[PDB]
């Protein structure tokens, strides 16, 4: 709400991320009849948060301490926030990479996230489940690409993964700059992904594991499609986009949410805001909910602001207080209000 990069639309974005994870957390790994029981309880601080929450405060806790991004302090949080709970229901590989992290010894904090996945570098969607900070302290397009690439690149160094965090900190950028139609919004998305894709690394990345040329920017192109069909179903977006731990089976398909939810749908009660029925959607689709909520929901919030999260369910989030905090403070010191 309000004016580009409003303080509203700092809180809102990470309050969203915060309800889609905690939310989305119940229907981890689902049908839209029964989703609307659910939410029913929340109309405190009962839902816990996971992973998907726990590293996007340590990147913004990293951001504020230096005010800057700090390769070796980000990435020892990672590591210190993991030591300190690690039953926030982290990925499988990434934990190799924290251990690593956590040795002293380690003096390139990059490379542990390069050996991962026989030296390939892991595609899952941890990089860009907690991007949404670097568009908070970003203002430029070249900012948060450069950023949102190294933040991921300390845990996802496939251009898979980190182009997925890329992608969904440009979604945030575009919903911090407020109104827009769907159509200007994914084609200026589709746009940066098609040039990031006609990198040479990208491509032989992609080709390596046998998938289409410029996946991301694929799976951009089958989003306008989408929105321009007829009676879609969930069982054909999750065919289309996915609803996987893989970026790229959930990115795309967490933009596809936002863009889908800005208008009304008669399936979904009138009752609920347009924050709301995103995260609604996004959770009946099921696979991944946490992480596929969480990111609709931190472009969501960026766009409707924090007059669209609701107090009910936000105190029923862990942490939602100081979530809001760190909010104000990425508003205080990068936008410099
Ligand atoms: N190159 C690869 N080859 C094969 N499998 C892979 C590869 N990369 C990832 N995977 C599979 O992808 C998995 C995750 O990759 P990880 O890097 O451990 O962690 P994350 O931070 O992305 O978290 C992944 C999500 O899952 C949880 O719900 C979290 O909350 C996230 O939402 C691996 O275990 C592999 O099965
Ligand atoms: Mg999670």
Known sequence: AGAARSLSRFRGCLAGALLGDC????????????????????????????????????????????????????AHRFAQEYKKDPDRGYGAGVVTVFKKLLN???????????????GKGSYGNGGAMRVA??????????????????????????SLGYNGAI????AVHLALQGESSS??????????????????????????????????????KKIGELLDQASVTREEVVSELGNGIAAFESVPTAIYCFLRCMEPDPEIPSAFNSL??????????????????????????????????????????????????????????????
């Open 23 to 74: 939310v989305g957390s119940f229907y981890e790994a689902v049908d839209l009849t029964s989703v609307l029981r659910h939410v029913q309880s929340l109309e405190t601080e009962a839902l816990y948060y996971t992973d998907d929450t726990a590293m996007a405060r340590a990147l913004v806790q990293s951001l504020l301490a230096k005010e800057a991004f700090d390769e070796v302090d980000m």
């Open 276 to 337: 709301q029925r995103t995260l609604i959607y996004s959770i009946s689709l099921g696979g991944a909910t946490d992480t596929i909520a969480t990111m609709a929901g931190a472009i969501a919030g960026a766009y409707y602001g924090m007059d669209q999260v609701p107090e009910s369910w936000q105190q029923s989030c862990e942490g939602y207080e100081e979530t809001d905090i760190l909010a104000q403070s990425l508003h205080r010191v990068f936008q410099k209000s």
């Open 167 to 170: 992608l969904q900190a440009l």
């Open 133 to 158: 900070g670097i568009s908070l302290a970003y203002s430029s397009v070249q900012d948060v690409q450069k950023f949102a690439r190294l933040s991921a690149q300390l845990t996802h160094a496939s």
């Open 183 to 220: 159509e200007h919004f994914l084609k200026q998305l589709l746009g940066h992904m098609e040039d990031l894709e006609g990198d040479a690394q990208s491509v032989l990345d992609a080709r390596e594991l046998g998938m289409e040329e410029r996946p991301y920017s694929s799976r951009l």
């Open 104 to 118: 002293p010894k380690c003096r390139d904090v990059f490379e542990p996230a390069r050996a991962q996945f026989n």
